[PDB]
Chain A
Amino acid sequence: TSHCRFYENKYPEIDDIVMVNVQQIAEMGAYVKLLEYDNIEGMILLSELSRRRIRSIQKLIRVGKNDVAVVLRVDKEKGYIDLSKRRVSSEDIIKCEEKYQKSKTVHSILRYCAEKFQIPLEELYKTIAWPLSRKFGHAYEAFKLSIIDETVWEGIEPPSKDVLDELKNYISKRLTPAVKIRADVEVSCFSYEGIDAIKDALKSAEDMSTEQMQVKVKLVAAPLYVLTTQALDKQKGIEQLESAIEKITEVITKYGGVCNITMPPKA
C-alpha cells in the first residue's frame, strides 16, 4: 500500500513545486491528487491551468498522466489544496523532474521492501527513511553511501534486522551504477626506442590498478592514447588517471621524445 508521504509531514507548504497525476476534470476545474506528497486532493482551476489560451483541456491535461505544478494556498484542518500550473518557470520543471525521480526511486525501493515483508509502509518509513532524510536531507544519497560506505546504518533502528538485511540486498541488487571516465593523451615521440616505452608505461599502469576498479590504457591512435576507467567511487579514478599521466611523463622525459595533452581526465 503506497501511502505515508515522502516528506516529514503529510501536508504541503506555501510556495513549493510539486508534480501531480490528474484523476478527473470538472467544469470549474480539476480536484486532483498530489504525488510529491501522499494522497491529499486539491483544485487546479482552468484559468490557472494552461499557459496559452485554454482552447482544449483534453490535449493539455491528459488525465492519468504526470504534470508539474505549484501550490498557492493550503487547508491545514482536514486537507485541501489550491494549486497552480501556468506559473511553472522553464527552470522549475527541471528541478521538479529530478526531485520526483529521486523520490520515485526511494519510494519504489521501500514499496518493494513493504511488499516482501507485508508490513505497512508507514512503520517502515518511520523506522528507516525519516532518520536518513533528517541526517542527509534525502535518503538516496544515504543509499549511495551504503553502496560505498556502510557506516550509514549505525544508530538507526529497523523494525527487525531481517528488514535491514533484505533492504541492503535490494540496494546491492537494484542501485548498481560506475562512471566511464575517459581521457586522451597526445603521443609525440619520435625517439629511438618507443614501443618498450609504452610497454613499461602500461606495465606500471596495471601495477597500481586496484582490485575494485580496473585500469586499462586503450590504443585508438598512435598519438591519441585513450584512458578509460570505471569510477565506482567517482572521486579516486581522477587520481588514478593523474598518477598514470605522471608515470607516462616520467617515461617520456628521458627517452628523447615528448608528449602532449588534449583531453585531461574528465567524466
Chain B
Amino acid sequence: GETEEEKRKREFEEGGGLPEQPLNPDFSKLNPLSAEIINRQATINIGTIGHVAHGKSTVVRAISGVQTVRFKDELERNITIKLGYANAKIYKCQEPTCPEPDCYRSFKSDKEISPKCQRPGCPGRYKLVRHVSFVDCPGHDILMSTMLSGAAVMDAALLLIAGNESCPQPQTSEHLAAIEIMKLKHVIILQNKVDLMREESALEHQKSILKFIRGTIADGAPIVPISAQLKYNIDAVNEFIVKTIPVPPRDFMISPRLIVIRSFDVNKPGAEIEDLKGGVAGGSILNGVFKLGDEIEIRPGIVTKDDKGKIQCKPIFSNIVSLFAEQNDLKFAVPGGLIGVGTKVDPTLCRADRLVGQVVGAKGHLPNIYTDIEINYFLLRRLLGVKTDGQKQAKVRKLEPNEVLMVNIGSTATGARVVAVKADMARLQLTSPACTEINEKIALSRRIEKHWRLIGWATIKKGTTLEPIA
C-alpha cells in the first residue's frame, strides 16, 4: 500500500539509478556506446521541423515527456524565438518474446538505467540503446536565423507534414533544403494530422509527399504516421531514429571548439546574492572533449566602437565552474551534445538573446574574428518557403554589391555588405564580428518581400582578420 513516490523510488533503486561519471576515465578507450558515456550525456542530436501552427512541442513531448516552455506570454502559442529543448532516452527490451515494434520506448531525463517493462505480460527490463537530445526549431518566415542555427546544432531531422492542409507545404521544403545545405541526409518524415483523415486520404497524402521528394537530394527518408494527441506510435519514431540515423564520426583527435547558441544566467531573484551562481551559456559540441575546471573564451567578446568606429572585440575569457549535460552537473563532455557551460561571467551576458550563434574555445587555441571575407556560394532555381498562388515560384535574383544580406555562418547571424560579386564568389564586410576556424558552412538570406528568405549555401575561403586585444 505504498504511495506512488515510494514505488517509483524503489524502481529507481532497482533500475540502477543515475550513476555518477568518474573523474578521470581512460579517454582513448571510450566510444559513445560506453556505459560511462551513454548514462548521462547526449550522443545524437535530433531536431523537429515543420510548418507554422503544426505542433513540434507536442510531438516532442509525446516522444520524450519533457515540455518546452515557449515563454514571454505572447509567444506561448504562435511561435517561439528561443530553443525548445527536451530529453529522451530510447529503450529496448532485453527479451526476444516482446514485440519488436512495441519494445521500443522513450523516457524522461530523470529515468533510471533499466526501467521495468510497461507492456502488460513480459517480465523483462528495458535497456538504453542510445542517448539523444531533441531541439525545437521555430517554423515561421520571420524567424529564419534560428532555424539555420538549429540546422547547425542538428545532426538529424524530423519533418512534420499535416494532412488536411495543403500537401505540398513550402516551409517544410525550405527546412528540408536548408538541412541538406548542412550536409544531413538522415531525415525522417512524419505525418502530423492522421486521426481526422479517412482511409483513402492518408494514402493520397502519402503519394503527394512521395511526389514532393523525387528530385531533391534526400533519398531514403522514411514516412511515419504519428498523432500528437493520442500519444501513440512514438515507439515507431524511436525505432526509425535508432535504425536509420548513425553516429557522425567524432572522436578525440579533433580540436576542442564549442558553438554557443542560447543564454541562461543563474540568478535567483529575491534570494541573497551571497548564494548565487555564475553566467551560463547554452552551446553544443561539434568537436573536442571538455572537462570541469577548464578555461574558455568567447572570442567575439565585447564588441566596442571607438571614436573612429572600428570594431574592438575583447575576448571574454573565463573559468568553467560547472558543466551540465541534460540531467546533472558532470565532469567530462563527449563530442556531439548540448551543454549549459556555466562560468564566473557577469549575469548581464547570459540573460537575453545575446550569445546567439557564436563560437567559444578552450585555452591553447586562437580562433580568428574577421571583417572582410571571401565566400564561394551557389544558389538554386526556385524559392522555398514562399506561397505563389499558382504562378511560377519565384527565382532567386543575383546578389548586388552594398546590399544588406544576412550571411548566417552555420549559426552566427551576421549582416554582411557585398563589396564585389563574380560568377560564383563574393566578398563581404561584416559589422558584427564573426569567427572562422576550419570550414563553418554558411547559409545566405536576402530581403525582397519584407522578410528573410534563404537563397543558397556558402563556404569561406579567405578573409581579413583582427587579432584579439589583451
Say yes or no: B314 contacts A198, CB within 8 Å.
no
Say yes or no: A192 contacts B347, CB within 8 Å.
no
- Residues facing B in A196-219 (CB within 8 A) are 196-199, 202-203, 216-219
Residues of B with C-beta under 8 A to A220: 269
Residue among B269, B273, B351 having the largest count of chain A Cβ atoms under 10 Å: B273
Say yes or no: A190 contacts B267, CB within 8 Å.
no
Q: How far is the CA of A59 from the CA of B318 in the complex (A)?
A: 74
B247, CB-defined interface residue at 8 Å: no
Chain A residue with Cβ nearest B297: A192
Q: Given contacts A194-B278, A257-B346, is CB(A219)–CB(B317) below 8 Å?
A: no
- Residues facing A in B410-459 (CB within 8 A) are none
A120, CB-defined interface residue at 8 Å: no
Residues of A with C-beta under 8 A to B272: 202, 216
Q: How far is the CA of A191 from the CA of B347 in the complex (A)?
A: 10
Q: Given contacts A216-B272, A223-B351, is CB(A195)–CB(B314) below 8 Å?
A: no
A23, CB-defined interface residue at 8 Å: no
Say yes or no: B346 contacts A187, CB within 8 Å.
yes
Say yes or no: B274 contacts A197, CB within 8 Å.
no
A26, CB-defined interface residue at 8 Å: no
B388, CB-defined interface residue at 8 Å: no
B83, CB-defined interface residue at 8 Å: no
Q: How far is the CA of A123 from the CA of B344 in the complex (A)?
A: 69
Q: How far is the CA of A219 from the CA of B265 in the complex (A)?
A: 13
- Residues facing B in A65-111 (CB within 8 A) are none
Interface residues as binary, A16-37 with B (CB distance below 8 Å gives 1, 0 otherwise): 0000000000000000000000
Say yes or no: A189 contacts B344, CB within 8 Å.
no
A141, CB-defined interface residue at 8 Å: no
Q: How far is the CA of A203 from the CA of B314 in the complex (A)?
A: 29
B35, CB-defined interface residue at 8 Å: no
Say yes or no: A190 contacts B348, CB within 8 Å.
yes
Residues of B with C-beta under 8 A to A196: 344
Say yes or no: A256 contacts B276, CB within 8 Å.
no
Q: How far is the CA of A215 from the CA of B351 in the complex (A)?
A: 26
Q: Given contacts A221-B351, A222-B265, A222-B267, is CB(A199)–CB(B273) below 8 Å?
A: yes
B367, CB-defined interface residue at 8 Å: no
Say yes or no: B269 contacts A195, CB within 8 Å.
no
Q: Given contacts A194-B278, A219-B267, A222-B351, is CB(A189)–CB(B346) below 8 Å?
A: yes
A193, CB-defined interface residue at 8 Å: yes
| Size of B's binding interface in residues, CB under 8 A | 28
B263 CB, min distance to chain A CBs, angstroms = 10
Q: Given contacts A190-B316, A192-B317, A193-B318, is CB(A222)–CB(B273) below 8 Å?
A: no
Say yes or no: A195 contacts B348, CB within 8 Å.
no
B3 CB, min distance to chain A CBs, angstroms = 38
B64 CB, min distance to chain A CBs, angstroms = 30
Say yes or no: B273 contacts A219, CB within 8 Å.
yes
Q: How far is the CA of A257 from the CA of B272 in the complex (A)?
A: 23
Residues of B with C-beta under 8 A to A216: 272
Q: How far is the CA of A203 from the CA of B279 in the complex (A)?
A: 20
Q: Given contacts A219-B267, A222-B265, is CB(A198)–CB(B278) below 8 Å?
A: no
A248 CB, min distance to chain B CBs, angstroms = 12
- Residues facing A in B252-302 (CB within 8 A) are 265, 267-274, 276-279, 301-302
Q: How far is the CA of A216 from the CA of B272 in the complex (A)?
A: 8
A20 CB, min distance to chain B CBs, angstroms = 49
B345 CB, min distance to chain A CBs, angstroms = 5
Say yes or no: B344 contacts A193, CB within 8 Å.
yes
Q: Given contacts A192-B318, A220-B269, A222-B267, is CB(A199)–CB(B349) below 8 Å?
A: no
Chain B residue with Cβ nearest A188: B348
Interface residues as binary, A219-231 with B (CB distance below 8 Å gives 1, 0 otherwise): 1111100000000
Residues of A with C-beta under 8 A to B348: 187-190, 194, 222-223
Say yes or no: A190 contacts B270, CB within 8 Å.
no
Say yes or no: B345 contacts A192, CB within 8 Å.
yes
Say yes or no: A198 contacts B279, CB within 8 Å.
no
Say yes or no: A218 contacts B346, CB within 8 Å.
no
Chain B residue with Cβ nearest A205: B273
B179, CB-defined interface residue at 8 Å: no
Residues of A with C-beta under 8 A to B279: 194-195
Chain B residue with Cβ nearest A255: B346
Say yes or no: B274 contacts A195, CB within 8 Å.
no
B160, CB-defined interface residue at 8 Å: no
Residues of B with C-beta under 8 A to A194: 278-279, 344-349
Residues of B with C-beta under 8 A to A195: 276-279, 344-347
Residues of B with C-beta under 8 A to A218: 269-270
A22 CB, min distance to chain B CBs, angstroms = 51
Q: How far is the CA of A187 from the CA of B279 in the complex (A)?
A: 14
- Contacting B276 at CB < 8 Å: which of A188, A189, A193, A199? A199
- Residues facing A in B322-381 (CB within 8 A) are 344-351
A244 CB, min distance to chain B CBs, angstroms = 13
A80 CB, min distance to chain B CBs, angstroms = 63
Chain B residue with Cβ nearest A197: B346
A188 CB, min distance to chain B CBs, angstroms = 6
- Contacting B273 at CB < 8 Å: which of A189, A217, A223? A217
Residues of A with C-beta under 8 A to B349: 189-190, 194
B269 CB, min distance to chain A CBs, angstroms = 5
Residues of A with C-beta under 8 A to B316: 190-192
Residue among B276, B314, B346, B349 having the largest count of chain A Cβ atoms under 10 Å: B346
Residues of B with C-beta under 8 A to A217: 273
Q: How far is the CA of A203 from the CA of B276 in the complex (A)?
A: 13
Chain B residue with Cβ nearest A206: B274
- Residues facing A in B390-415 (CB within 8 A) are none
Q: How far is the CA of A216 from the CA of B273 in the complex (A)?
A: 10
Residues of A with C-beta under 8 A to B269: 218-220
- Residues facing B in A169-190 (CB within 8 A) are 187-190
Residues of A with C-beta under 8 A to B351: 221-223
Kindly list the 6 A-B residue pairs having the minimum CB-CB distance in the complex, ordered from nearest. Answer: A194-B346, A189-B346, A222-B347, A222-B351, A195-B278, A193-B344
Can you name 15 extra interface pairs (CB under 8 A) apart from A190-B345, A194-B347? A187-B346, A187-B347, A187-B348, A188-B348, A191-B316, A191-B345, A191-B346, A192-B317, A193-B319, A194-B278, A194-B344, A195-B344, A222-B346, A222-B350, A223-B348
11 A-B residue pairs with Cβ-Cβ distance under 8 Å, sorted by A, are A189-B348, A191-B345, A192-B345, A194-B348, A195-B345, A202-B273, A220-B269, A221-B351, A222-B265, A223-B351, A256-B314
